[PDB]
From Swiss-Prot, chains A, B:
One of its GO terms (biological process) is monounsaturated fatty acid biosynthetic process. PROSITE patterns: KS3_1, KS3_2. Involved in the type II fatty acid elongation cycle. Catalyzes the elongation of a wide range of acyl-ACP by the addition of two carbons from malonyl-ACP to an acyl acceptor. Can efficiently catalyze the conversion of palmitoleoyl-ACP (cis-hexadec-9-enoyl-ACP) to cis-vaccenoyl-ACP (cis-octadec-11-enoyl-ACP), an essential step in the thermal regulation of fatty acid composition. Is able to catalyze the condensation reaction when CoA is the carrier for both substrates. The lineage of its organism: Bacteria, Pseudomonadati, Pseudomonadota, Gammaproteobacteria, Enterobacterales. This is 3-oxoacyl-[acyl-carrier-protein] synthase 2. Changing R205G: Impairs the binding of CoA. 10-fold increase in catalytic efficiency with dodecanoyl-CoA and malonyl-CoA. The keyword Protease does not apply.
Amino acid sequence: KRRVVVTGLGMLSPVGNTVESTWKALLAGQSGISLIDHFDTSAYATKFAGLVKDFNCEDIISRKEQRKMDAFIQYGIVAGVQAMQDSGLEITEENATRIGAAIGSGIGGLGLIEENHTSLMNGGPRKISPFFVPSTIVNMVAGHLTIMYGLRGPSISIATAQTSGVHNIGHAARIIAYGDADVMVAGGAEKASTPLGVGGFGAARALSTRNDNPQAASRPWDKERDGFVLGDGAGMLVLEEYEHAKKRGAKIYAELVGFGMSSDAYHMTSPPENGAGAALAMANALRDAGIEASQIGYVNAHGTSTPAGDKAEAQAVKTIFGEAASRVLVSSTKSMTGHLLGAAGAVESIYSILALRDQAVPPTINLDNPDEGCDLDFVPHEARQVSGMEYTLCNSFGFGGTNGSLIFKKI
Amino acid sequence: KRRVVVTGLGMLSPVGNTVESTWKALLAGQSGISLIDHFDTSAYATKFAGLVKDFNCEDIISRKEQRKMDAFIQYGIVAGVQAMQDSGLEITEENATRIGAAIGSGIGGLGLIEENHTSLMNGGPRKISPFFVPSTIVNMVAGHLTIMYGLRGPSISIATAQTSGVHNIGHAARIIAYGDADVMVAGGAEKASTPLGVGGFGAARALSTRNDNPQAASRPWDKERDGFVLGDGAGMLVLEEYEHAKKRGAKIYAELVGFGMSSDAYHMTSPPENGAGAALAMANALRDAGIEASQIGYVNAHGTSTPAGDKAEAQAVKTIFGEAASRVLVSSTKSMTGHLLGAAGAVESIYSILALRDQAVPPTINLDNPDEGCDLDFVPHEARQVSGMEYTLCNSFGFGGTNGSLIFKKI
């Protein structure tokens, strides 16, 4: 029976370019949301997002190699290098074959897709970059990292839209526990803050339009919610078989004990009013961990700040927690970070882990006026100190009614 | 110990719009390659591809719903419906929760990406479709099918470029064998025959430019190879836990016994000259099946018809088979079908299965003059009858040095 533990963390987010700086900001209730300036937003109904500030990879990726990669790829490689470094793992010829990667993205290289399509329209196929395909496709973060570190074990990339980060981490663990690997770098990367990303989610009327106050836009469970806020970033974890970790004297952040998946089988983009899908995913993770809902102390919600989605997740929590629905802490970091899509469940898994290390639960900021029949504790406004918390649960749901839940356990 | 078996098959390919018609064509050595006419190819160095002919979904997808989906999605849903129907499985409230999907794509909705970007350039963000995001993203075949059939078990979508079909089928099996599901519809869909797809792989100089003879272009291991040929399609299999299948009186095509993954850790798009990556993937699948290379009778190669890739796979076969390198049959159906990218390993897994049912191995057509140091039997020109073949192996390798191998066993 193989246990999986988290021994390395990496991260780029709208509130910090490292794991510790990101975490510190979240516990301080800071927003990472700001107005966009990298493209003309005049015609856009949403003119803001959660951006990665002063991103720099010069020391990690040559400007010459940068040409071959979309921003989402560069982000994911940087967060991957941070995680590899943090793990302290040494890759040997004897090792290579047993270390892999499970890293994806929801939308991939929109920026380079646009640039390449603009070239084609303006001057024909001759103007398309020879790097078009491999610079934009979702699996290239795992591609580049395995090459950089000489990793030869299994590499997959799960692209389940807004559920990717969770799915990738969950399967990286299945792979280790199955015996196909001893270590996996797992997570997601996204850089969808582009004319197509912003224009596209805006066309769907899914985005908040509160441009007069970008930092107050993201407000899960708040009566004045008006759609999600888009965020860029990457979250990576180094997952490792327990005995392997111990033997190397690895620093161990927490243990991955439960992974649950489900499908809404309802609508292509909207969640069912009763969150039955989210319920099954949480129910499946608990059964996989072999514990009861009552044992979870903190749920890092999907909580995107859409009228219908926030309401469906709340329904799902009540269904799963029932009695202890009020004693469990539930919060959406998306209130400060925005929605990182394919990277959401990856960064949120990290927050779920750090909440166990620090016994602190980040707040859901902007929750000035909660919905009515709410009996749940959404950790409004201020971070909460906790005491004997041994497990956290991370939710992610996505287009296609695809859901995932991960369960982390202290030590 | 849970066994996985294939109880349903679905398929759209350049040589047929059904499983049996496709298979019949391949055994007859027919090409599905033709000149493109859905876009002006004047400026294109490659003016042909493996197209799906007279595709029709009218009875399966309303014209009203079609608007919300890229061709690759419509293809995948149709192949999915065929597979569900072929399986005879009946979805009940007691069932729903135990049936899922693992379906992906390498590139996703290029056509709708282009259409939407063209609109944006021509008339601004206001012209972007509200369906932009969910009509193009890779996980929407699993999205739509789970909804269509009320499937509520696990849904994931692996996007590992040219390795997707294999990866998805392999993980759908891991999911069942793990206990997270009893049935999974698994596979891939691709429709990359677009200005960006054709122009993009052409910019990389990866495509064959033999336009004077489209049907002879794809010619794996042939001295006059000049790059791969692009093909469109979808391949879907219904995978099912053995006991569950038996109890329902399911028709069983074959058993899925081995799944292997590896990474080249070499180059972002090219394979290492020694095919060490492909070797490890095949080696891992054998160990997972717990059999010896000598036991495989037919290898459906990745065999894309590139100078370097064909040569690397041959090296990898010799390394793995050694002695029996000459006694194993190896063939590339891509010689007739073209390269279906994310759908390649899905349709090729189906051919690997049917070769067991019919004891017949499709040829590698166009192999007029093999490379030199070749001692391998590439089933040139004509299909081969075989006798006591109990196992087949299917290879898929992709950008990012990502590899997968699947092993099918008779009965």
